[PDB]
Amino acid sequence: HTGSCMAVYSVENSWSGGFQGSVEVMNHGTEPLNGWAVQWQPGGGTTLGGVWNGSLTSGSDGTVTVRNVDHNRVVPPDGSVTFGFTATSTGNDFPVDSIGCVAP
Numbered sequence: 001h002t003g004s005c006m007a008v009y010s011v012e013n014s015w016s017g018g019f020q021g022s023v024e025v026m027n028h029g030t031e032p033l034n035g036w037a038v039q040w041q042p043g044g045g046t047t048l049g050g051v052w053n054g055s056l057t058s059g060s061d062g063t064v065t066v067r068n069v070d071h072n073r074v075v076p077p078d079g080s081v082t083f084g085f086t087a088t089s090t091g092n093d094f095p096v097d098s099i100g101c102v103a104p
Contacts, residue, residue, distance in 0.1 A: 003030035007038055007101035011094070018049070018088040023066065025101050026080035032072075033103050039065035040099040045091020053083035 006028040012020040023038050041063050042048070048056055048064045055068040072081050 003028075004103060005029045005033075005036060005101040007099075009038070009040075009099050012084065014093045016093065017090070018046075018086065019093050019095075020084065020086045021095065022082060022084040023101075024080055024082040025069070027078055029103065032077060035068050036101060036103050037065045037067035038099070038101045039063055041096055042087070043089070043092025043095050046087050046089040046093070046095075049086045049088045051083070051085040054085070056085055 005025055007023055007025045009023045010021065012022050014020075025036065025038060039059075048058060050056070051066055053069070053071050054066050055070075056064070056066045058064045066083065066085050069081055069083060071083070075081060
């Protein structure tokens with residue numbers, strides 16, 4: 001009954017026309033899950049660009065996500081892992097709110 005991941009989302013830096021962000025995701029879930037993701041609604045006039053230590057995609061539902069953490073293979077299991085991404089903008093150089101993680 002219940003038992004899902006938890007995440008800590010932070011903004012690294014922002015600049016005119018874009019920003020950088022990072023997320024830590026801990027294995028608070030009862031099971032380790034390959035392909036888990038961190039998704040959010042982008043700010044008005046902002047969109048994702050690239051990622052490192054992970055993969056990223058945009059969705060047609062007007063939301064964007066960072067998925068498929070690979071580097072959990074290098075660290076020991078049942079720990080926490082972090083990764084970063086960058087976004088580009090023509091309006092909101094900031095996100096909407098703080099967000100958590102999801103599982104497939």
